[PDB]
Amino acid sequence: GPLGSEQIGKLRSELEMVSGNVRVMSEMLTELVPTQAEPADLELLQELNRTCRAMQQRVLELIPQIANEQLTEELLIVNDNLNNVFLRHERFERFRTG
């Protein structure tokens, strides 16, 4: 629907899944030590990054399609959270390398 409220039920389930991915990635970055993380941990972080990257494109696609202002702001916040975890991962990698 143009407003965003028409398919809110469907959208909520989608967003819960997106938020779950961001949470696991965020919490792993906080728990893991850059220079101590094992290859297995790094593998998972990359898996989460890949998934969250595709989810970000989807969120960016939804934003302009939804008329509702509260829902649009919610999506923008979710996008902010994705960028935040991506930057942390970038920082994590800078520390681990170089």
């Binding site: 389930s13 819960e16 899944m17 779950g20 991915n21 949470r23 696991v24 965020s26 919490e27 792993m28 970055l29 906080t30 728990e31 893991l32 297995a40 941990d41 593998e43 998972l44 898996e47 998934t51």
Partner: protein, 76 residues
């Protein structure tokens, strides 16, 4: 106690466990009601990967706690 195990696929698994239950026991419980082989289960708590040998008590996992289940990809 009752704990929750959330997947990254929109599923919330409610388990009835005990503080003394080991991570191995928990994975077995998950297979029992979800059909997911233990060898393919990656359990995480607050960003920390869990070892099959340790117990829920060891990781300070208490009542109403939420764990995350990440499936190992069969082809990476």
């Amino acid at each position: 106690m009752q704990i929750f195990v959330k997947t990254l696929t929109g599923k919330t698994i409610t388990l009835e466990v005990e503080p003394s239950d080991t991570i191995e026991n928990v994975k077995a419980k998950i297979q029992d009601k979800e059909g997911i082989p233990p060898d393919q289960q990656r359990l995480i708590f607050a960003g920390k990967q869990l070892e099959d040998g340790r117990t829920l008590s060891d990781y300070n996992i208490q009542k109403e706690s939420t764990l995350h289940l990440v499936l190992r990809l069969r082809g990476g």
